Structures are given as C-alpha cells and as structure tokens.
A paper describes a structure:
In order to gain insight into the function and the post-translational maturation process of the glycosylated [name], three crystal structures were determined that represent different maturation states. These structures demonstrate that the 28 kDa and 40 kDa fragment which have been derived by a proteolytic cleavage remain associated. The core αββα sandwich fold and a cysteine residue at the N-terminus of the 40 kDa fragment (C249) classify the [name] as a member of the structurally defined N-terminal nucleophile (Ntn) hydrolase superfamily. However, the structural classification of the [name] as an Ntn hydrolase implies a hydrolytic activity on a kind of non-peptide amide bond as commonly observed for Ntn hydrolases.
Numbering used by the authors:
A (entry chain A), B (entry chain A): 61 to 239, 245 to 594
The structure:
C-alpha cells in the first residue's frame, strides 16, 4: 500500500450507482483511511466511518467497499499467505472440500431464508448488515459494485474463508478431514487498591498470518430494520485485525459502550459432539461475535446474543469486561464487571465472575476451559489421564506461570512484559518431561514454537517445531478504553528469545508477502502511529 | 525438490490399481527422474520413460503421474508464480472468465465426442494420449489415481492453463478481454562449406516464468489404437520446458526422428479474424504441437498434422529442420531440410525453404511473419504505416542485427553469443526515435525490458519497462541432435548487460519461489548437468 490512502463511497445521483473517490468527502455513504506502518511498527491502521443519513444496509455494504479499496494490496498479500490454496482445484481431500462447499452454501442459504421470513427482527437485521459488509468487501475488491435490495449470494470460498478461519478449526474434524495450536493467552488484572483494571490479550497464530491492521469502525447502525429504532450501543469499536477479515479474529475489541471483549480458543476433543455442528440453526462464530459486540450494553446482554444459534465452531472462553461497572479505587460491586462465557458444540455456559476477579485480583486465560462441566464434556479428562497436567486447568505450564508472576503487573508496561514473556530455556515451568530436550518453547505465555529442534521427541503435535506461536500483545486500561485506545506490540516475542527473522529461520521457504524480514517491534499506542 | 528424486508407477495386480513407488522399477508402467540444479545451472532435468508392454493409454496416463510425483514442489511454485490468480474467484473481468470457462468446456467436450465417434482414427488416438497425460499429471498432483477406460473430464482451470499459456494470448482478444511481448527469436545457420547446420532458439518471456526443466520423454506410443500399428516416429524427444507444462511452451524440440522443431510467436492484430477461433473444429496449439511432433517423419508430414483443426490461437512461425535431409559438407539437396509454417486465425501457409537456407546460408526468426500473405492478412501493414520499420519484416531492429551479425556464428559458442546478444546502450540499431531516451532494451536479439526507465516516453507497450525479455538460449548441431543433445543457458542475458537480480531490480515485490535471486548462469550441455 501507500503510506496513507483515503477513499470515499458516494451515492451518485447522476446514475443512482455507487462509485469510489479519492480523499475525504462529507456526504459520502462511507469513507476509509489506511495508514501502513508495517515496516516501522508492524501495524497498519484503518479508520472507517459511515454516514448516518443513509440506511444501515447501504452503510454496511459501503463499509465493506471503502475498506477493500484502501487495503487492496494487503488483502491480496494476506490472501496469498493464508488461504490461497485451501480447497483449490487440487485439494487432496476431495471428499472434505465437497462437504465444506455444501455445508457453507446450505448455511448461507439458511441465513437468507431467515432474513426473508423475519423482516422486522433486530437480530436478523444485524446478521444482514454483517453479511452485506462482507458482500461489499468482496464486490469492491472485484471492482464491480452492485448493492442488493433483497436477497443476495455470498461466495463460499471467497472472502468468507478469511472470516471463517477460526471456525474452520472445528469444521474440519466435524466433516471428517484427516489432518495442535494453543491459540492465545489473556490476562485481566485488577491493580492494588483497585486503582485501575487492566485487560490484555496475546494472540498465538501461524507466522504467515502476521500482516496486521488495527481497525477503528465508527458506524451508524440501528438496532432494527425500522428507523424508529435507537442506534446500536456498539457503533464505535477499535480492534486488532487482519487484511480482509472484517472482525478481530485473534479477538480483542474495545467497544464505545464501555465493553472490552476477548477470548482464548478452548476447542473440543470429543467427537460425539460434532453432531451439533449443522448448516441450519447454526451461525458461524465470527458473525455471532460481531452481532453481540454491536447490540450489547451489559456483559449479560452480550452473553445472551452470542449464545443464539451456537454453531460449535470456533470454541472459546469469552471474557466480557464492562468498564461502566468498574469504579476506580472502589470496592467490589458484586456483579457486572466480569462475565465468562464458554462454548463447545451444543453447550454454552455463562457466569458472572466479578467476585472471583476481586477475591483473587485477576483472571487468566489459556487453551483450557474454566467451567468444570465444559472441561468434562469436551473430553479433556482422558487427555489429563493420558498426558498429565499439560491438559489440567490449574496445573498446565501457562496456568502456573500466571500463578507465580501475575501479581507483578502493576501497570501497562508490566502487563506487556508478562504477556510477551518467554524464557523456556531457563524457566523450570517450561520443562517437558516426556520430551527430548526437556525445555519447550510452547510452555510460555507468548509461545515461540519455531525455537524447538526439528528433530526432537515430542508426545503431541502442539510441542513440535512450528512456524507458530505468540504474534502480538494488546493492552488497555480504564482511562484508555474511555478514550478508545490501546497499547499494541506486533510480532513474536523478543524480550528474551532471539528476535524472529524469516531469513535466518528454518521457514525461509514459506511465503510472507509484505511482512518484515526481522521482527523487533516495540509496543505503540493507538490511535495512530 | 531434492537434488535427485526417482518415482515409478506400477499396475499392482494385488488390487488392479495404480500406485507410486520410490526408485527405478523395471516392470513399471512408467518411471521418472528429476534432478534439480536450478541453483547451480538454472535448469532442472527430467528423464521420463514408459513401458511398451502396456497399452498407449495407460502409458500416457502414467507418464503424467510419474512426472508430477518427481516434480511436485516445482509445479506448486511455478503455478504460484504464473497462473495462480488467473480467473480466480475474484477476476475483475467476470464477463471474460465466464466466456473462457464456456469456451474451454465446450472445446474439451468436442474433443471427447470426436474420440467417441472415431475409435479407429490415429489422429484422435494421438490427441487422447496427450489429454490422458494431462489427466495423469493432474490426478497425480491431487494424489488420487483413477485411470479412465472411456470418456473423461479435464478441469478447465486446472493444469490446463499451464498448457494453454501461449494459446491464451489469442483467446483474450478473441473473447473481448480488455488488457506487447515480442515472444522469442530464432536462428538456423548453415556453416561455411556446409560443414554443419546449427539451429538455435531464445525464449522471450516474463521473468516470473523462470523455473525451467529440460525434459526427455522416452515413450512407447503407437500410431493408432490397434496394436498392429508401428511405433510413432517421435517416441524419443528432448525439449526445454517448465514445471507442469507437458510440452515445450517456449518451443524447442529435438526429436528422435531427426527433426528439430521451434517457433516464434507472430500473433495477430486483425480482429476481423477472431471469428475463426471456435470451440468446435479447433484444437488448441499445444496439443497440435505434440501430435505433430509424435507422428512426423518429414517436415512436410509435420506441417500436414499441425494444420489440422487450426485454432488461430498461439500464432507462430514454425521452423522444422530435418537432419535426415542434411548431408555434411555436401551441396543443396534442393528440398526437405527446412520447412516454414505460419499460422493466423483461419489461415495456414506452408513452404519448403531449403533453397533459401542454402542461398543465403541462414534463416532468422522474430515476431514478424515471413509470408507476404500472412503479413497482410494479420493486419501488420497498418502498423508499419503508423509506426514505421519496427513492424517491417526486413527493417525491424532484430532483422537488421541478424543481417549484419549472423555470418559470425561459426560454431556453438558463436551461436550462443549472438542469441544472447544485447548491447542496447551502444548499438545504433537499438535506437528508438519515437522514444525518450532513444536506446531501448527491447531492440536486441535477447531482450532486456527491465533495463528501460519506468518514466520513459514510449510509443507502445512492447517498449515500456517490463519484467520481460529473453530468458534462455538453446542450441544444437547435426552431431548433437544425432545424440539427442543440446546446449542450454538459463536466465536473462548478462554478456554485456548487468546480470539480472530480483533483489536489486524494480520488481523485487513480484513473487518468484524457487528462483535464484541472481542470474549469472553459463551454457551447459545436456544430457545431465
Ligand atoms: C436503502 O437505501 C437504498 C438507496 O437509497 C435503497 O436502494 C434502492 O432500492 C430501490 C428498490 O427498493 C431501487 O429503485 C428501484 O430499482 C428497480 C430496479 O432497477 C426499479 O424497478 C424501480 O423502478 C426502482 O427504481 C434503487 O435502485 C436502489 N438503489 C440502489 C443504489 O441500489 C434501499 O431500498 C434502501 N433499503 C434497503 C432495504 O436496503
Ligand atoms: C489398457 O490397459 C488397461 C489396463 O490393463 C485397461 O484398463 C482396464 O479396463 C477394464 C475395462 O475394459 C477394467 O476391467 C473392468 O472393470 C469394470 C469396472 O470395475 C468391471 O465392470 C469389469 O468386470 C472389468 O473388471 C479394468 O479395471 C481396467 N484397469 C484399470 C487399471 O483401470 C484398458 O481397458 C486398456 N485399454 C484402454 C482402452 O485404455
Ligand atoms: C486518516 O484519517 C484520519 C481521520 O481524521 C486522520 O487523522 C489521518 O491523518 C489520516 N491519515 C493520514 C496519515 O493521512
Ligand atoms: C464422520 O465419520 C463418522 C464415522 O467415524 C460418521 O459417523 C459421520 O457421519 C461422519 N461425519 C459427517 C456427517 O461427515
Ligand atoms: C469430570 O470427570 C471426572 C471423571 O473423569 C469426575 O471425577 C469429575 O467429578 C467430573 N466433573 C464434574 C463434576 O462434572
Ligand atoms: C536419473 O536417472 C538417469 C537415467 O539413467 C540417471 O542417469 C541419473 O543418474 C539419475 N539421476 C540421479 C542424479 O540420481
Ligand atoms: C467481441 O466484440 C465484438 C464487438 O466489438 C462482437 O462483434 C463480438 O461478438 C465479440 N466477440 C465474442 C464472440 O465474444
Ligand atoms: C500487402 O498490402 C499492401 C497494401 O497495404 C500491398 O501494397 C501489398 O502488395 C500487399 N501484399 C500482397 C502481395 O498481398
Ligand atoms: Na483465538
Ligand atoms: Na513463443
């Protein structure tokens, strides 16, 4: 991309068509601004806004159009790095790809019918806006605008598999594809004397996904299809994202409603549960994620909306922090501050864990579900019995590191240092006994899988050498959320581990267009470089 | 790939299935051996052989299978560099891609019907073998073998657009796609006192296509479907090729029948001729190319076979040199040594130019058709009148360079030096008067378009700065053809121009997996590094 690029989408009355322009224009349906600083900071920055004098449907479709236009090259590169050959005209597993094509077409169609049968329903109005935005993104990148007034078709293997990237980790085993992760860590820390409440997230992902865009949507959507509806509470939102992906993905959101939402992927290892993964009655996580962010005021409200049409795909522990319920220096309000939701196929458990947050002064998060029920139901007891405390909730490497180091986070920088922490060679809690060598780079808060020897003896895939591990840290406070801001550090950890460099890594061969060769980037404050 | 890899395909009687093995196995249907030396020489080397105790159909299908298995990674990389996003799920020109999908499906189906209606015909037996080999290549790469006994389907946008790469330059304008080249130069030189006859070719192509494989097929096909048929004359053939592409492409072949075939793309700039480009009655050039190579004994025989079902796609001047007709040190046989064929939509002209070769002692080739008729019919007179002698047959930059330098080629090395020649800064014949600056890197025998300034004033696209130009030189003599050998130099010219390096070029951004960064490779003799 350029250093900075600005686009606007106007409803041209000379033709009744939508067309793109360059620069800010006040009466445009939507306008976007992408600042690329991936070379200097490891982040691109996108500020997107829609005009509230047009209907939500047009606003939404436009929001996709303007985003795609400012971020063309990044979308191309990210596509080329991540999901370019996924179910291509060659896929070895021709059985699976047919089943996935059928599942998604049947699913998208089911959503279309629900919209057609429920024109007055807020919830299905919210899904349509989300799907219209994806339509916009795609049509804009394809360079042929066409605003649908009624029913419309979304291409199964287009920009959808940029959104369902997380959902796919559960769809493959559900559809009998033959072929670990850990996938993220999070910390919610209450500071001494209740001075402030810090919430942070660290994405674990493949290093190929390391094209990053911090996105700020300032929208003007309403709760329902009629215009007598009030504007949605979650109209303003800042979040860590990727090119094309119209939602977080790694999952860190700061909403203008005083809500901070984030997750860690708990997954599911019980196959008798894939039967609850269906085309009809299921909405893929990423949409539910968005719809919930948009409508929520409370943590309880958020939970309610996300639960609807649970898909059993992209199975997470969802932390919903409500800063409206947080009083600086005050005591426990007893409720409303922290809500934990956990999802597995056919099961969703919700609880208000405010008392817990205040009693223990923190909430940690990793690949292991909290709720005793979910843990058993997802079939983790067999893995504890087979592989020991690595699958235990309170005894896994990461759980222990938090247990003895979490009290040290006293401010923002202290939080970053912990969330970036990885010293597997010298920390006794990173030792794997079933391994050879014993120390493992997975057994840290910010994983660094590439630094494991390619010829080691490991009990399971998650501990093998991989172009995978922690790839970012995002942190926010009370005051910083009040001002829609965060601290963000891009790339794998280099606090103690040698900084990641593609050239010098055993993965030099893997393609990574637009990615910096060396990753030595420091945290920065948004908004804007 | 590895340094060397060997695969075999056996008809396993324990199941009646085809399965792949590692290493040479004598009773296999087919076996292939790929030696990668792209880092040292710029060439990979493939020796492929089929068993003559099986039927041609199985032999052919197997020949595709074994090739794909030994060259998996190269096929992947070449695909990723060349035609990965061609008519993807995003193509801007959604009108064109639909028309191309329809054209190719209708074309492939037309061929299938012809086979079904002509089970005793040699010609359609030869097409089926070619198509079965493409089927093999694809199915093998997909990892699911399935030998078709009767009718079979070839996927339009699979490994077909690796083969139709040349055909596509004429299909796009024919199907009204909105969106130069020069595309190759060749020299056939008769040495003083008729001591020897040298024939050489230099490909002009995009630098992204610079993954190269010199291929040697040693096949056991018969002329017709019945087994009373004699073995085809062109069973053994060495040629310069690319990963996946089951024919030359750039087009240089040395056949075991004493025939050397090569071309330069003359194209067509008269749109009133695209009407002759049809799904039915047309066979795409690449197949015709193969079929002709396989059946030919004479140059006249070759010409006959290539002419059949002319498609008007991939329009070339075809030089057919028959070393059987060549007598060392002797005088002119009057006929049979050199045959020139030229193709444009709906028109093919053939002639025996032996007398010409002997009278002038050479035959040069460039982007301009020889035959006066073809020149007029393809609409080049308007371009001469509009842009001067750059489109003239005898007065274009390359025609003049041959005219004054061709006598100097006295041996193999002298031939390479000419075919690699490019000194655009200091050669008066590389000066473009309508240009700014005047000297142009296109106006050489081995083009070097990248060395033109990106901010120059050029009259037409062919002279703009491009990641395009001469990318190889292949040379052969009488004695070297007798022993199925050639000299081959990989990469853009560096005799006088600074050697090409992706890193230091204004095209560093373009992806080129498996390609050496710097290109300073010298000529080598095949067979084998
Ligand atoms: C939100 O606002 C947009 C734009 O104001 C509305 O889109 C417009 O919808 C009407 C149909 O309800 C279209 O006008 C009609 O077009 C048809 C087909 O050409 C024609 O038969 C009719 O005579 C009429 O002219 C109009 O083209 C369309 N505008 C665009 C840019 O697509 C939309 O209906 C509003 N609400 C919704 C549900 O999105
Ligand atoms: C060339 O040789 C190959 C291999 O020897 C021949 O392929 C074989 O063709 C026959 C059918 O003509 C197949 O046997 C039949 O299979 C069907 C369907 O399963 C079954 O109904 C019959 O009872 C019979 O068993 C055989 O499977 C097949 N072999 C392979 C490996 O595919 C081929 O026919 C010969 N000629 C041609 C035209 O290619
Ligand atoms: C993009 O737009 C924002 C919105 O005001 C502005 O602050 C910023 O300067 C723009 N980007 C650049 C660097 O041009
Ligand atoms: C997956 O395979 C199981 C057998 O192991 C089968 O019962 C199930 O139907 C398959 N799932 C689907 C619906 O693809
Ligand atoms: C989970 O399963 C174990 C047996 O494997 C059992 O001991 C434990 O009570 C279960 N947890 C609950 C209460 O569901
Ligand atoms: C591949 O096979 C050929 C055929 O004989 C042989 O000469 C060559 O040594 C093999 N390649 C290598 C280097 O293993
Ligand atoms: C291409 O466009 C011309 C008009 O310029 C039209 O006559 C012709 O039918 C088109 N070719 C095809 C068949 O797509
Ligand atoms: C080619 O066309 C030109 C007129 O543009 C004419 O002078 C010339 O004779 C033609 N060549 C032949 C013989 O077809
Ligand atoms: Na995650
Ligand atoms: Na050519």
């Amino acid at each position: 991309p350029p250093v900075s690029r600005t686009r606007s989408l106007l409803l041209d009355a000379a033709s009744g068509q939508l067309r793109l322009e360059d620069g800010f224009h006040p009466d445009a349906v939507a306008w976007a601004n992408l600042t690329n600083a991936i070379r200097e900071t490891g982040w691109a920055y996108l500020d997107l806004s829609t005009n509230g004098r047009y209907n939500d449907s047009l606003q939404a479709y436009a929001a996709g159009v303007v985003e795609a236009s400012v971020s063309e090259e990044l979308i191309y590169m990210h596509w080329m790095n991540t999901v370019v050959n996924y179910c291509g005209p060659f896929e070895y597993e021709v059985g699976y790809c047919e089943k996935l094509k059928n599942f998604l077409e049947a699913n998208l169609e089911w959503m279309q019918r629900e919209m057609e049968l429920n024109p007055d329903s807020p919830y299905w109005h919210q899904v349509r806006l989300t799907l219209l935005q994806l339509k916009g993104l795609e049509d804009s990148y394809e360079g042929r605008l066409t605003f649908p007034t009624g029913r419309f078709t979304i291409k199964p293997l287009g920009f959808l598999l940029l959104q369902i990237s997380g959902d796919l980790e559960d769809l493959e085993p559900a559809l009998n594809k033959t072929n670990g992760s850990g996938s993220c860590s999070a910390l919610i820390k209450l500071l001494p004397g209740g001075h402030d409440l810090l919430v942070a997230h660290n994405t674990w992902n493949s290093y190929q996904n390391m094209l990053r865009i911090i996105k700020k949507y300032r929208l003007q959507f309403r709760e329902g299809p009629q215009e007598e509806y009030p504007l949605v509470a979650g109209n303003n939102l800042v979040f860590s994202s990727y090119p094309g992906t119209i939602f977080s993905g790694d999952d860190f959101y700061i909403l203008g409603s005083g809500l901070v939402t984030l997750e860690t992927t708990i997954g599911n290892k019980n196959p008798a549960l894939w039967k609850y993964v269906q085309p009809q009655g299921c909405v893929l996580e990423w949409i539910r994620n968005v719809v919930a962010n948009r409508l929520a005021l409370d943590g309880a409200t958020w939970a309610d909306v996300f639960k609807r049409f649970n898909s059993g795909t992209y199975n997470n522990q969802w932390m919903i922090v409500d800063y409206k319920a947080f009083l600086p220096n005050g005591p426990s309000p007893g409720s409303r501050v922290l809500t934990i939701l956990e999802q597995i196929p056919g099961m969703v458990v919700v609880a208000d864990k405010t008392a817990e947050l205040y009693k223990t002064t923190y909430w940690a998060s990793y690949n292991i579900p909290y709720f005793e029920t979910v843990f058993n139901a997802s079939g983790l007891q067999a893995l504890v019995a087979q592989y020991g405390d690595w699958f235990s909730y309170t005894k896994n490497p990461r759980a222990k590191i938090f247990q003895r180091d979490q009290s040290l986070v006293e401010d923002m920088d202290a939080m970053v240092r912990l969330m970036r922490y990885n010293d597997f060679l010298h920390d006794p809690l990173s030792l794997c006994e079933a391994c050879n060598p014993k120390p493992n780079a997975e057994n840290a808060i910010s994983a660094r899988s590439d630094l494991n020897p390619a010829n080691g003896s490991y009990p399971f895939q998650a501990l093998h050498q991989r172009a995978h591990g922690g790839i970012d840290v995002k942190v926010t406070s009370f005051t910083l959320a009040k001002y829609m801001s965060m601290l963000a550090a891009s790339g794998p950890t280099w606090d103690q581990c040698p900084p990641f460099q593609w050239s010098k890594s055993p993965f030099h061969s893997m393609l990574h267009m637009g990615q910096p060769d060396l990753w030595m980037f420091s945290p920065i404050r948004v908004p804007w470089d």
